[PDB]
Design a protein around this ligand. Structure first.
Ligand SMILES: [Cl-]
Ligand SMILES: [Cl-]
Ligand SMILES: [Zn+2]
Ligand SMILES: [Zn+2]
Lengths: 21, 30, 30, 21, 30, 21, 30, 21, 30, 21, 30, 21
């Protein structure tokens, strides 16, 4: 998931924004 | 914005900055 | 442990610390 | 909510666990 | 995204997040 | 400057990009 | 609480959150 | 010690609390 | 270098930075 | 103590070294 | 002061603490 | 540069200070 992806790979702020409430 | 390499608490900081007052949920695998 | 004011990014860092793999939600609107 | 409990007023690490999943 | 108060180390952490490899300048005197 | 824009007053992530190189 | 994997300054943050007003001592090897 | 253990292995908040004053 | 207000977690992060392997004590009661 | 020296009032990195071991 | 091993946002924190009101520029390779 | 050196190797605060404005 995002937690793993940002750490093992890269992730974008736009992808992060999907986890906002 | 640039892509991010974020582990541990740095991911949470980023979510915090990204989501602001909306807040967010942090849901690691397992 | 103790009680302190935990605000903003510090609050989410504390949640990350305390919840870790369980994950958590930060929902300031509440 | 968490902001009132932990920022505005103070909370313990245990109260913080209230917001874990 | 959102608008929040970003101060001090938090401001530079946000710049790091937002600029990353581009780099950035933090020039509070302005 | 950035402190006035983002700390004293509030700024978006986009405004923060103003200070990238 | 969950177990922690904490390096560098993250250990110090954790000690800070754990100890609060008691403070703490940070004593790495060597 | 604790500094090494938390980093190379894992450590608990309860173990951390031993370093409080 | 400079003089700034260093409080809370930021103070201990600064101590970690400045002391590193020497270690340090953070004893706010004093 | 350190809080008065560095938080309440301001301190240099050198003064911070006062609290190293 | 001790030598530092600083990656990612930790470098930016350090620059922040080191430079204070002077601010600083953060310029990674590439 | 400094960003790489502090991360891959070590760097000193004195070296860091060169990046201040
Ligand atoms: Cl703060
Ligand atoms: Cl890290
Ligand atoms: Zn802060
Ligand atoms: Zn880190």
């Amino acid at each position: 998931g995002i937690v793993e992806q940002c750490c093992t790979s890269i992730c974008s702020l736009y992808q992060l924004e999907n986890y906002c409430n | 914005f640039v892509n991010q390499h974020l582990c541990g608490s740095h991911l949470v900081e980023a979510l915090y900055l990204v989501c602001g007052e909306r807040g967010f949920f942090y849901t690691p695998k397992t």
